[PDB]
Amino acid sequence: VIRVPLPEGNQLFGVVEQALGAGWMDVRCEDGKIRRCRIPGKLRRRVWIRVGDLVIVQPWPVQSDKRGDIVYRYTQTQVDWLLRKGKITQEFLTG
Amino acid sequence: MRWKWIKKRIRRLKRQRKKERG
Amino acid sequence: GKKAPNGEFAGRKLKLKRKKFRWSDIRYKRRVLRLKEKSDPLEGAPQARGIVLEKIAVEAKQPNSGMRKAVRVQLIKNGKVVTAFCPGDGAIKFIDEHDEVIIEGIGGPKGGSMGDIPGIRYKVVKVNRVSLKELVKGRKEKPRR
RNA sequence: UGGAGGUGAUUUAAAUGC
RNA sequence: GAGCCCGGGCUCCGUGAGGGGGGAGAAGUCGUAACAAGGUAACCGUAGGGGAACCUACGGCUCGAUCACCUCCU
RNA sequence: GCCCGCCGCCUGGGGAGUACGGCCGCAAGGCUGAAACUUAAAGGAAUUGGCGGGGGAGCACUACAAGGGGUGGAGCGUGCGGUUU
RNA sequence: UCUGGCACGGCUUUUCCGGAGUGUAAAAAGCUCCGGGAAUAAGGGCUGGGCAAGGCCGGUGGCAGCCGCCGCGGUAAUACCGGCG
């Protein structure tokens, strides 16, 4: 049985657009905005994210439309599962 | 280093002093 | 001769020496001119009220990440833009935009923001002339407008 | 036993890592 | 004999497109500069040149290099 | 070193030996010389270790030479990578 | 629960009420004398190292926060929040 995390609350699916340096990434999100996202350290040590990965984002409580933290990165087969459940669209991933 | 800096300082000076002279 | 002239009538040289060499203490120089008093707004003061233009949250420093609660307040007579660090957990809540917010420094006037915070020179005590440590405790008073 | 010069010098061994 | 006014000059306060640098963030790129002789020793003042680190010339210095070769000194 | 006389210079780092101003210089430049801001270090000597495309001494047979045989060519046995299921 | 605490038994009785003069050269200040008369206003900070002067449980999980510095929070936190000491 396969199990895949999904965005909880106001959390958003996102595709990673650009690497800025220092754990800051520009992420195009599922509501249509580009957020400047932080990688919590607890994450940076565990994974290697890259441009054109799909992520869960936790927006910040101030400037919700401009900043967030990336909170979970998806593998390639999870992304396929999220395409097949209709969680994400193939048109959103490419951009 | 101080090679660097001397010519950087000189280039900054000139270029800027060019911008002042102009 | 370890420096100094020693001699009855020389003293004046002494007297100017010290003073000449006093101005290598940044702190002394600064006060005796009054650069402490001119630059880092306040006009020197203990504290300053100001209108909360908006609420902003900024990032933490180098080993760190966490969303500090900061306001943007405008000092009223000073008429200067100040970004500011807010004590307490929940807080950013009890501060409505366009309530009065009295502002102080925090941890040596030198410029030194505390280790975590990059910029923030200053502290907030108040929301509508009642403080933040009074609003972290539920009973003591609770806010208006 | 420990110190200062003068001149051969050796290209057969390759950038990077949070 | 004041304030007042007028024409010009000079200076200072509130504030402005644009522009300079700093201490940083450290996940993109280029290179390997220095730190080991860093793989062409390194620095140094001066001059030119190169995208960059930097290279080269001339003079200096060892805070200079590793044996080797030669020379001195308790 | 220990004393006595005078003189220059320093007063944490980086900003910066820069800005501005003045002085000097044909020019190139020099002399004089901050502040805003930022940092819990900058630094020095020695100790240990690891390291260097460093030097001496000594061994080795998973070393190399010397030497004998062979793997890599085929068929098959086997375990694996992969693919298939 | 022997630092101390509680029951219970007894004592005294700051504030508080009432009276005398005072003082006022009118009050108030109500002090001061006397009668009545209750065990009856205590808190704030900190407790990782510095400073130690002071440690466990529960929550939380490099978050939220703490922070004067050095650091501390990345799933057993004495450092955060709450409680208990």
Coordinates of C-alpha atoms (C1' of nucleotides) in Angstrom, one line a residue:
Chain A
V1 CA 0.0 0.0 0.0
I2 CA 1.3 3.5 -1.0
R3 CA 0.8 6.6 1.2
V4 CA 1.5 10.1 0.2
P5 CA 1.5 13.3 2.3
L6 CA -1.0 16.0 1.3
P7 CA -1.2 19.8 2.1
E8 CA -2.9 20.4 5.4
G9 CA -4.7 23.7 6.4
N10 CA -3.6 26.6 4.3
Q11 CA -0.5 24.7 3.0
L12 CA 0.1 24.7 -0.7
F13 CA 1.5 22.4 -3.4
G14 CA 4.4 24.1 -5.2
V15 CA 7.0 23.7 -7.9
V16 CA 10.5 24.9 -7.3
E17 CA 11.4 27.7 -9.8
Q18 CA 14.8 29.2 -8.8
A19 CA 17.6 28.6 -6.3
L20 CA 18.6 31.9 -4.7
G21 CA 21.4 30.6 -2.3
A22 CA 21.4 29.6 1.3
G23 CA 18.2 27.5 1.6
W24 CA 16.0 30.2 0.0
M25 CA 14.1 29.1 -3.1
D26 CA 11.5 30.8 -5.3
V27 CA 8.5 28.5 -5.5
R28 CA 5.5 28.8 -7.9
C29 CA 2.5 27.7 -5.8
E30 CA -0.9 26.1 -6.7
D31 CA -2.9 29.3 -6.0
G32 CA -0.8 31.2 -8.7
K33 CA 1.7 33.1 -6.6
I34 CA 5.5 32.9 -6.4
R35 CA 6.7 32.7 -2.8
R36 CA 10.1 33.2 -1.4
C37 CA 10.6 30.0 0.6
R38 CA 12.9 28.9 3.4
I39 CA 14.2 25.4 3.9
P40 CA 14.0 24.6 7.7
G41 CA 17.4 23.2 8.7
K42 CA 15.8 20.0 9.9
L43 CA 15.0 19.5 6.2
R44 CA 18.3 20.6 4.5
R45 CA 20.3 17.9 6.1
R46 CA 17.8 15.2 5.1
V47 CA 17.2 15.8 1.4
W48 CA 18.5 17.2 -1.8
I49 CA 15.7 19.3 -3.4
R50 CA 16.3 20.9 -6.9
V51 CA 14.8 23.1 -9.6
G52 CA 11.6 21.5 -10.9
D53 CA 10.7 19.6 -7.8
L54 CA 7.2 19.5 -6.3
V55 CA 6.9 20.5 -2.6
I56 CA 4.5 21.2 0.2
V57 CA 4.7 24.8 1.4
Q58 CA 3.6 26.3 4.7
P59 CA 3.0 30.0 4.2
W60 CA 4.2 32.4 6.9
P61 CA 1.6 34.1 9.2
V62 CA 2.7 37.5 7.9
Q63 CA 3.0 38.2 4.1
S64 CA 1.5 34.8 3.5
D65 CA 1.4 36.3 -0.3
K66 CA 5.2 36.4 -0.4
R67 CA 6.9 34.0 1.9
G68 CA 6.6 30.5 3.2
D69 CA 8.7 27.5 4.3
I70 CA 9.0 24.4 2.1
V71 CA 8.0 21.5 4.6
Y72 CA 8.1 18.3 2.5
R73 CA 9.6 17.4 -0.8
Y74 CA 8.0 14.8 -3.2
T75 CA 9.8 12.0 -5.0
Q76 CA 9.0 11.2 -8.7
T77 CA 6.8 8.0 -8.5
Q78 CA 4.5 10.5 -5.0
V79 CA 4.3 13.2 -7.8
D80 CA 2.9 10.7 -10.3
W81 CA 0.5 9.5 -7.6
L82 CA -0.6 13.2 -7.0
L83 CA -1.1 13.5 -10.8
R84 CA -3.3 10.3 -10.8
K85 CA -5.5 11.3 -7.9
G86 CA -6.0 14.7 -9.5
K87 CA -4.2 16.5 -6.7
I88 CA -1.9 18.3 -9.2
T89 CA -2.3 18.9 -12.9
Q90 CA 0.4 18.1 -15.6
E91 CA 0.0 21.8 -16.7
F92 CA 0.8 23.1 -13.2
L93 CA 4.1 21.0 -13.0
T94 CA 5.6 22.2 -16.3
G95 CA 4.5 25.9 -16.0
Chain B
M1 CA 45.6 40.5 -1.6
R2 CA 47.2 44.1 -1.2
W3 CA 47.9 44.1 -5.0
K4 CA 44.3 43.4 -5.5
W5 CA 43.1 46.0 -3.2
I6 CA 45.5 48.7 -4.4
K7 CA 44.3 48.4 -8.0
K8 CA 40.7 47.9 -7.0
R9 CA 41.1 51.1 -4.9
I10 CA 42.9 52.8 -7.8
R11 CA 40.2 51.7 -10.3
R12 CA 37.4 52.7 -8.0
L13 CA 39.2 56.0 -7.5
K14 CA 39.9 56.6 -11.2
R15 CA 36.5 55.5 -12.5
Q16 CA 34.8 57.5 -9.9
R17 CA 37.3 60.3 -10.3
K18 CA 36.5 60.1 -14.0
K19 CA 32.8 60.4 -13.0
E20 CA 33.7 63.5 -10.9
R21 CA 36.0 65.0 -13.5
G22 CA 32.9 64.4 -15.7
Chain C
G1 CA 62.3 58.4 28.8
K2 CA 59.1 56.5 28.8
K3 CA 56.9 59.0 27.2
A4 CA 56.3 61.9 28.8
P5 CA 58.1 65.0 29.2
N6 CA 58.8 65.3 32.9
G7 CA 59.8 68.7 33.9
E8 CA 58.3 71.5 35.9
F9 CA 57.0 73.8 33.2
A10 CA 56.2 71.2 30.5
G11 CA 52.8 70.2 31.7
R12 CA 50.9 71.9 29.0
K13 CA 52.3 69.2 26.6
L14 CA 51.0 66.6 28.9
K15 CA 47.7 68.5 29.1
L16 CA 47.2 68.5 25.3
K17 CA 48.6 65.0 24.8
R18 CA 45.8 63.3 26.8
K19 CA 43.1 65.2 25.1
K20 CA 44.7 64.3 21.7
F21 CA 44.8 60.7 22.6
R22 CA 41.4 60.7 24.4
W23 CA 39.6 60.8 20.9
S24 CA 40.7 57.3 20.2
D25 CA 37.9 56.1 22.5
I26 CA 35.0 55.9 20.1
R27 CA 32.5 56.1 23.0
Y28 CA 34.1 59.2 24.4
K29 CA 34.4 61.0 21.2
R30 CA 30.9 60.1 20.3
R31 CA 29.3 61.5 23.4
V32 CA 31.4 64.6 23.6
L33 CA 30.3 65.5 20.1
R34 CA 26.8 63.9 20.6
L35 CA 26.7 61.4 17.8
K36 CA 24.9 59.0 20.1
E37 CA 22.3 61.7 20.5
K38 CA 22.0 62.7 16.8
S39 CA 21.9 59.5 14.7
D40 CA 19.8 56.6 16.2
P41 CA 16.6 58.6 16.1
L42 CA 14.8 59.2 19.5
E43 CA 16.5 62.6 19.8
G44 CA 18.3 60.7 22.8
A45 CA 15.2 59.8 24.7
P46 CA 14.2 56.9 27.0
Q47 CA 11.2 56.0 24.8
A48 CA 8.9 57.1 21.8
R49 CA 5.2 56.6 20.9
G50 CA 4.4 56.0 17.3
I51 CA 1.7 54.9 14.9
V52 CA 1.9 51.2 13.8
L53 CA 2.1 51.5 10.0
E54 CA 1.9 47.8 9.5
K55 CA 3.0 44.4 10.8
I56 CA 5.9 42.6 9.3
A57 CA 7.7 39.4 10.1
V58 CA 11.4 38.9 9.2
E59 CA 13.8 35.9 9.3
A60 CA 16.3 34.9 11.9
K61 CA 20.2 35.1 11.6
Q62 CA 23.0 32.4 10.9
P63 CA 22.7 29.2 13.0
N64 CA 18.9 30.2 13.4
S65 CA 15.4 30.5 11.7
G66 CA 12.2 31.7 13.3
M67 CA 9.7 34.3 12.7
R68 CA 10.2 37.2 15.0
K69 CA 7.4 39.5 15.5
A70 CA 8.3 43.0 14.3
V71 CA 6.3 46.1 13.7
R72 CA 6.9 49.0 11.5
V73 CA 6.1 52.1 13.6
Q74 CA 6.5 55.8 12.7
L75 CA 7.7 58.0 15.5
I76 CA 5.4 61.0 15.6
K77 CA 7.6 64.1 16.3
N78 CA 10.8 62.3 15.2
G79 CA 8.8 61.4 12.1
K80 CA 11.2 58.5 11.3
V81 CA 10.6 55.0 10.0
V82 CA 11.4 52.4 12.7
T83 CA 11.2 48.6 12.3
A84 CA 10.9 46.9 15.7
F85 CA 11.0 43.7 17.7
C86 CA 8.1 42.6 19.7
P87 CA 8.5 40.7 22.9
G88 CA 6.2 37.7 23.8
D89 CA 4.8 34.6 22.1
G90 CA 1.2 35.3 20.7
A91 CA 1.6 39.1 20.8
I92 CA 1.3 40.2 17.1
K93 CA -2.3 39.6 17.7
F94 CA -3.0 42.2 20.5
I95 CA -1.4 44.9 18.2
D96 CA -4.0 46.3 15.8
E97 CA -2.6 48.4 12.9
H98 CA -3.0 52.2 13.8
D99 CA -2.9 51.8 17.6
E100 CA -0.3 53.9 19.4
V101 CA 2.9 51.9 20.1
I102 CA 5.5 53.2 22.5
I103 CA 9.0 52.1 21.6
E104 CA 12.3 51.7 23.5
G105 CA 15.8 50.3 22.8
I106 CA 17.0 46.8 23.8
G107 CA 20.4 45.6 25.0
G108 CA 23.0 48.5 24.7
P109 CA 22.3 51.6 22.5
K110 CA 25.6 50.9 20.6
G111 CA 23.4 49.7 17.7
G112 CA 23.6 46.1 18.8
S113 CA 20.4 44.3 17.9
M114 CA 20.4 41.1 20.2
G115 CA 22.3 38.1 18.7
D116 CA 19.3 36.6 16.9
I117 CA 17.8 39.7 15.4
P118 CA 19.7 41.5 12.6
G119 CA 18.4 45.0 12.6
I120 CA 16.2 45.5 15.5
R121 CA 17.7 48.2 17.7
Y122 CA 14.4 48.7 19.6
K123 CA 11.7 47.1 21.7
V124 CA 8.0 47.7 22.0
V125 CA 6.3 48.0 25.4
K126 CA 2.8 49.2 24.6
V127 CA -0.5 48.7 22.8
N128 CA -3.0 51.7 23.3
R129 CA -1.2 52.7 26.5
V130 CA -1.3 49.3 28.0
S131 CA 1.8 47.0 27.7
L132 CA 2.6 43.6 26.1
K133 CA 3.8 41.7 29.1
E134 CA 0.3 42.8 30.6
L135 CA -1.4 41.2 27.5
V136 CA 0.6 37.9 27.6
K137 CA -1.3 37.4 31.0
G138 CA -5.0 37.1 30.3
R139 CA -6.4 38.7 33.5
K140 CA -4.6 42.0 33.7
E141 CA -6.1 44.0 31.0
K142 CA -7.3 43.2 27.4
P143 CA -7.2 45.5 24.3
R144 CA -9.5 48.1 22.7
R145 CA -10.0 49.6 19.2
Chain D
rU1 C1' 77.1 20.0 18.1
rG2 C1' 73.9 23.7 16.5
rG3 C1' 73.4 28.9 12.8
rA4 C1' 74.1 32.3 7.8
rG5 C1' 74.8 33.0 2.8
rG6 C1' 76.0 32.1 -3.1
rU7 C1' 72.5 28.6 -7.4
rG8 C1' 71.2 24.0 -9.6
rA9 C1' 67.3 23.1 -9.1
rU10 C1' 62.3 18.7 -9.8
rU11 C1' 57.9 18.4 -13.6
rU12 C1' 57.0 11.9 -13.9
rA13 C1' 51.7 13.7 -9.5
rA14 C1' 44.8 17.1 -12.3
rA15 C1' 39.3 21.8 -10.1
rU16 C1' 35.6 20.7 -6.2
rG17 C1' 32.6 18.9 -1.3
rC18 C1' 27.0 21.4 2.2
Chain E
rG1 C1' 16.2 105.1 16.2
rA2 C1' 13.2 98.9 16.3
rG3 C1' 10.3 96.4 13.2
rC4 C1' 8.9 96.2 8.5
rC5 C1' 10.3 95.8 3.1
rC6 C1' 12.9 95.2 -1.6
rG7 C1' 17.0 93.3 -5.0
rG8 C1' 21.1 90.3 -5.0
rG9 C1' 24.8 86.9 -2.7
rC10 C1' 26.1 83.1 0.9
rU11 C1' 24.5 79.1 4.4
rC12 C1' 21.4 75.9 7.0
rC13 C1' 16.7 72.8 8.2
rG14 C1' 12.1 69.3 6.1
rU15 C1' 12.0 66.4 2.0
rG16 C1' 13.5 63.7 -3.7
rA17 C1' 14.2 60.4 -9.2
rG18 C1' 18.6 58.4 -9.3
rG19 C1' 23.3 56.7 -7.3
rG20 C1' 28.0 54.2 -3.6
rG21 C1' 29.7 51.3 -0.4
rG22 C1' 29.5 48.1 4.3
rG23 C1' 28.4 43.7 7.8
rA24 C1' 25.4 39.7 5.8
rG25 C1' 22.0 35.4 3.6
rA26 C1' 24.9 31.4 2.2
rA27 C1' 21.7 25.6 -2.8
rG28 C1' 23.0 28.7 -8.4
rU29 C1' 28.2 30.1 -12.1
rC30 C1' 33.0 30.7 -13.4
rG31 C1' 38.0 29.7 -11.9
rU32 C1' 42.1 27.8 -8.4
rA33 C1' 44.3 32.8 -6.0
rA34 C1' 46.5 32.1 -1.1
rC35 C1' 47.3 28.7 3.1
rA36 C1' 51.9 22.4 2.0
rA37 C1' 57.5 24.6 -2.8
rG38 C1' 49.2 25.2 -3.0
rG39 C1' 52.0 22.0 -7.8
rU40 C1' 54.9 29.0 -11.6
rA41 C1' 57.8 30.4 -3.5
rA42 C1' 55.4 34.2 -1.2
rC43 C1' 55.0 39.2 0.0
rC44 C1' 56.3 44.1 -1.2
rG45 C1' 56.3 49.8 -3.9
rU46 C1' 55.7 51.1 -8.7
rA47 C1' 53.7 50.5 -14.0
rG48 C1' 50.7 48.0 -17.8
rG49 C1' 47.3 44.4 -19.1
rG50 C1' 43.2 40.6 -18.2
rG51 C1' 36.0 38.8 -17.1
rA52 C1' 37.4 37.2 -12.3
rA53 C1' 40.5 35.4 -8.7
rC54 C1' 45.2 37.4 -11.1
rC55 C1' 49.5 37.7 -14.7
rU56 C1' 53.6 40.0 -16.1
rA57 C1' 58.2 43.8 -15.7
rC58 C1' 61.6 46.2 -12.5
rG59 C1' 63.6 47.0 -8.0
rG60 C1' 63.4 45.2 -2.8
rC61 C1' 62.5 41.7 1.4
rU62 C1' 62.2 36.9 4.0
rC63 C1' 57.9 36.9 7.5
rG64 C1' 61.9 32.0 1.4
rA65 C1' 61.0 27.6 -0.6
rU66 C1' 63.2 21.3 -0.5
rC67 C1' 67.2 18.2 -1.0
rA68 C1' 71.6 18.9 -3.6
rC69 C1' 76.4 21.9 -4.6
rC70 C1' 79.9 25.3 -2.5
rU71 C1' 81.4 28.9 1.4
rC72 C1' 81.7 30.5 6.9
rC73 C1' 80.5 29.8 12.9
rU74 C1' 80.5 27.9 18.9
Chain F
rG1 C1' 68.3 44.7 31.2
rC2 C1' 68.2 48.7 34.9
rC3 C1' 67.9 54.1 35.1
rC4 C1' 67.7 59.3 33.5
rG5 C1' 66.0 63.5 29.0
rC6 C1' 63.2 64.4 24.6
rC7 C1' 60.7 63.4 20.2
rG8 C1' 56.8 60.4 16.8
rC9 C1' 53.0 57.1 17.0
rC10 C1' 48.9 53.4 19.0
rU11 C1' 44.2 52.7 21.8
rG12 C1' 39.5 45.8 19.0
rG13 C1' 38.0 44.3 13.8
rG14 C1' 36.0 45.5 9.2
rG15 C1' 33.8 49.8 6.9
rA16 C1' 38.8 52.4 5.1
rG17 C1' 43.7 54.3 4.4
rU18 C1' 38.0 55.1 1.4
rA19 C1' 34.3 60.0 1.2
rC20 C1' 34.3 65.0 1.8
rG21 C1' 37.4 69.4 2.6
rG22 C1' 42.2 71.6 2.1
rC23 C1' 47.3 71.4 0.9
rC24 C1' 51.1 69.6 -2.8
rG25 C1' 52.0 67.5 -7.7
rC26 C1' 52.8 68.4 -15.3
rA27 C1' 50.4 63.8 -14.9
rA28 C1' 50.4 59.6 -12.7
rG29 C1' 49.6 60.4 -7.8
rG30 C1' 51.0 62.0 -2.6
rC31 C1' 50.2 64.3 2.2
rU32 C1' 46.2 64.9 5.6
rG33 C1' 41.8 61.9 7.0
rA34 C1' 35.9 60.5 9.1
rA35 C1' 31.0 58.8 9.9
rA36 C1' 26.7 56.0 9.1
rC37 C1' 26.5 50.3 9.5
rU38 C1' 28.2 45.6 11.2
rU39 C1' 30.9 41.7 14.3
rA40 C1' 32.6 38.1 19.1
rA41 C1' 36.1 38.1 17.1
rA42 C1' 40.9 40.2 14.3
rG43 C1' 45.5 38.6 16.1
rG44 C1' 50.6 36.6 18.0
rA45 C1' 53.8 32.6 19.8
rA46 C1' 54.4 27.9 20.8
rU47 C1' 52.0 22.2 21.3
rU48 C1' 49.9 18.0 19.5
rG49 C1' 48.0 15.7 15.6
rG50 C1' 46.5 15.0 10.3
rC51 C1' 48.3 16.7 5.9
rG52 C1' 52.3 18.3 1.5
rG53 C1' 53.2 17.1 -5.8
rG54 C1' 59.1 17.3 0.9
rG55 C1' 64.3 14.8 2.5
rG56 C1' 67.1 10.3 5.1
rA57 C1' 66.9 5.3 7.2
rG58 C1' 64.3 0.2 7.0
rC59 C1' 61.3 -3.6 5.7
rA60 C1' 57.1 -6.3 2.9
rC61 C1' 55.8 -10.6 -0.8
rU62 C1' 47.6 -8.2 -0.6
rA63 C1' 54.0 -4.6 -2.9
rC64 C1' 57.4 -4.3 -7.7
rA65 C1' 61.3 -6.1 -10.1
rA66 C1' 63.5 -10.9 -11.3
rG67 C1' 60.8 -15.5 -12.3
rG68 C1' 56.8 -19.8 -13.0
rG69 C1' 51.9 -20.2 -13.7
rG70 C1' 47.2 -18.1 -15.0
rU71 C1' 42.6 -14.6 -15.3
rG72 C1' 40.7 -11.5 -19.8
rG73 C1' 39.5 -15.4 -25.9
rA74 C1' 35.6 -21.0 -25.5
rG75 C1' 32.3 -24.3 -23.4
rC76 C1' 30.4 -25.2 -18.9
rG77 C1' 29.6 -24.5 -13.1
rU78 C1' 28.7 -20.7 -9.9
rG79 C1' 27.3 -15.5 -7.4
rC80 C1' 26.1 -10.9 -8.9
rG81 C1' 24.4 -6.3 -12.3
rG82 C1' 20.5 -5.8 -15.4
rU83 C1' 16.1 -7.3 -17.5
rU84 C1' 11.8 -10.5 -17.2
rU85 C1' 8.1 -12.4 -14.1
Chain G
rU1 C1' 5.9 17.6 54.6
rC2 C1' 10.8 17.5 61.0
rU3 C1' 14.8 23.7 56.6
rG4 C1' 9.8 23.6 58.4
rG5 C1' 4.2 22.4 58.4
rC6 C1' -0.6 21.3 60.4
rA7 C1' -4.2 20.3 63.9
rC8 C1' -5.3 22.0 68.6
rG9 C1' -4.6 25.0 73.4
rG10 C1' -3.2 29.8 75.4
rC11 C1' -1.1 34.9 75.0
rU12 C1' -0.7 39.6 72.9
rU13 C1' -3.3 42.8 69.3
rU14 C1' -0.5 46.8 63.9
rU15 C1' -5.2 48.5 61.0
rC16 C1' -10.2 49.8 62.6
rC17 C1' -14.3 52.1 65.7
rG18 C1' -15.4 55.6 69.6
rG19 C1' -14.1 59.4 73.3
rA20 C1' -10.6 63.5 75.8
rG21 C1' -7.9 67.4 74.8
rU22 C1' -5.3 69.4 71.0
rG23 C1' -4.7 72.3 67.1
rU24 C1' -7.1 75.7 64.3
rA25 C1' -5.1 81.1 66.5
rA26 C1' -11.5 78.0 60.7
rA27 C1' -10.9 73.2 59.5
rA28 C1' -7.9 69.2 58.0
rA29 C1' -3.4 67.0 59.2
rG30 C1' -6.1 63.1 63.6
rC31 C1' -1.4 63.2 65.9
rU32 C1' -1.1 62.2 71.3
rC33 C1' -4.0 60.2 76.0
rC34 C1' -7.9 56.6 77.0
rG35 C1' -12.2 52.8 76.2
rG36 C1' -13.7 49.1 72.4
rG37 C1' -11.1 45.8 69.3
rA38 C1' -9.3 41.4 64.7
rA39 C1' -3.7 37.0 63.5
rU40 C1' -5.9 40.5 60.5
rA41 C1' -2.3 44.3 52.9
rA42 C1' 3.0 40.3 50.2
rG43 C1' 5.1 40.2 46.2
rG44 C1' 8.7 40.2 42.0
rG45 C1' 12.6 38.1 39.7
rC46 C1' 15.6 34.1 38.7
rU47 C1' 17.2 28.6 39.0
rG48 C1' 22.8 26.0 31.5
rG49 C1' 27.3 28.2 31.8
rG50 C1' 28.6 33.8 33.3
rC51 C1' 27.3 34.6 36.9
rA52 C1' 26.0 29.0 40.0
rA53 C1' 22.6 31.3 44.7
rG54 C1' 19.3 27.7 43.2
rG55 C1' 16.4 20.9 39.8
rC56 C1' 12.5 17.6 38.9
rC57 C1' 8.0 16.3 36.2
rG58 C1' 4.7 17.2 32.2
rG59 C1' 4.1 19.4 27.5
rU60 C1' 6.6 20.9 23.0
rG61 C1' 10.1 19.3 19.1
rG62 C1' 16.0 24.2 15.5
rC63 C1' 8.9 25.0 16.0
rA64 C1' 6.8 28.2 19.0
rG65 C1' 10.0 30.9 22.0
rC66 C1' 14.0 32.2 25.3
rC67 C1' 18.5 35.9 24.7
rG68 C1' 22.8 41.1 28.7
rC69 C1' 27.0 37.5 26.7
rC70 C1' 28.7 32.9 25.7
rG71 C1' 24.3 29.7 23.5
rC72 C1' 19.9 26.8 24.1
rG73 C1' 15.2 24.4 21.1
rG74 C1' 16.7 19.7 15.1
rU75 C1' 11.6 13.6 19.5
rA76 C1' 14.6 11.1 27.0
rA77 C1' 15.4 19.9 27.0
rU78 C1' 17.5 20.8 34.3
rA79 C1' 18.2 26.5 29.6
rC80 C1' 11.3 27.2 25.9
rC81 C1' 5.8 27.0 27.7
rG82 C1' 3.0 25.1 32.2
rG83 C1' 3.2 22.8 36.9
rC84 C1' 5.7 21.2 41.0
rG85 C1' 10.0 22.2 44.0

